[PDB]
């Protein structure tokens, strides 16, 4: 996680907190890349996720609306 993308990116707040919302803008935004939105679209596989389902009722659930983040933006 912590790591440099193009200088200083160290972000280790990769969960389902606020800065994690900034994230779905990439995967709501064209200006990203498809590789940009695997790296979180593979959270689900690490975290044990059953679906689509589980998925967004997880962010939903905290009060956050990922239902954009589903490549569907």
């Known amino acids: 996680k912590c790591y440099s993308q193009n200088g200083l990116v160290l972000h280790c707040d990769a969960n389902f907190l606020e800065h994690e919302l900034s994230y779905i803008d990439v995967l709501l935004d064209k200006?990203?890349?498809?590789?940009?939105?695997?790296?979180?679209?593979?959270y689900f596989a690490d975290k044990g996720l059953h679906s689509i389902k589980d998925i967004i009722n997880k962010a939903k659930q905290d009060g956050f609306d990922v239902s954009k983040y589903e490549h569907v933006k």
Request: hydrophobic share 25%; proline share 0%.
């Open 31 to 42: 200006n990203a890349d498809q590789a940009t939105k695997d790296n979180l679209r593979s």
